Amino acid sequence: DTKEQRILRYVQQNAKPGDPQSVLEAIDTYCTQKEWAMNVGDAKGQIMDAVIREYSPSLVLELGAYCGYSAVRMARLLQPGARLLTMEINPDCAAITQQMLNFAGLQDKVTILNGASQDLIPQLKKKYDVDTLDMVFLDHWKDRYLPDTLLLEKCGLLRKGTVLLADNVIVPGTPDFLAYVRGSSSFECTHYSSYLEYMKVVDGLEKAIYQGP
Numbered sequence: 001d002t003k004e005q006r007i008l009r010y011v012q013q014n015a016k017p018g019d020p021q022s023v024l025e026a027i028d029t030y031c032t033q034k035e036w037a038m039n040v041g042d043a044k045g046q047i048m049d050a051v052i053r054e055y056s057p058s059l060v061l062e063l064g065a066y067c068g069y070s071a072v073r074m075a076r077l078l079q080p081g082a083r084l085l086t087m088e089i090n091p092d093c094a095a096i097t098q099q100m101l102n103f104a105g106l107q108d109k110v111t112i113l114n115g116a117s118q119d120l121i122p123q124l125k126k127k128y129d130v131d132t133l134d135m136v137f138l139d140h141w142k143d144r145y146l147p148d149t150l151l152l153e154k155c156g157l158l159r160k161g162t163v164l165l166a167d168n169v170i171v172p173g174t175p176d177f178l179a180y181v182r183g184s185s186s187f188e189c190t191h192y193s194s195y196l197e198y199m200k201v202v203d204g205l206e207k208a209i210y211q212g213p
């Protein structure tokens, strides 16, 4: 029995099936009151929600599903016909994420990719019928944010106006990524100050909008 399985079970026992908001609320309750876990959380989540609503993306890539909290958060705001692809390196987590989405009634909008980002990114266009991405959410290994951004760019997955939105740029931090995007004329960056999930520690999201080569 793992922490992640306990979260899934709590959602199954307490949330309303087919109600994404209820699923988010049960996850946030469990992680607030019983066991901390690395979900984006409600405070950063509201900022995510605002960004998604602003850009109305048709095709979103998530790096790092975990338990599917952000997958649920994002997919519930997607317009009909829009798609979320989410990459998860751990097969236990990838299974839990599928179950979370199923419960929420979002399975039709979301496609889970099991594998390492660096291995899956070059297969997106051909295997998943992708031209360019409208939005990318980065929440996987923090040392992978920069090299996976360079890989997205190499593989032709970014277009002018693709929105990159990165969690944990302060805590635990992604200092190479943040230096890079903020220094590059290919990115226009905005910082959204917030708090680390379930805590009083300052963290933030960075939005980096790709400008072209």
Ligand SMILES: O=C(NC/C=C/[C@H]1OC[C@H](O)[C@@H]1O)c1cc([N+](=O)[O-])cc(O)c1O
Pocket: 038, 039, 040, 064, 065, 066, 088, 089, 090, 093, 139, 140, 141, 142, 167, 168, 171, 172, 196, 197
């Ligand atoms: O390592 C973090 N995320 C990367 C984890 C990536 C993989 O580990 C478990 C699962 O397989 C996931 O895809 C992290 C860590 C903290 N933290 O405070 O440690 C807060 C966060 O929001 C995080 O995303």
Ligand SMILES: [Cl-]
Pocket: 038, 039, 040, 041, 065, 066, 067, 068, 069, 070, 071
């Ligand atoms: Cl999450």
Ligand SMILES: [Mg+2]
Pocket: 038, 039, 040, 139, 167, 168
């Ligand atoms: Mg995170």
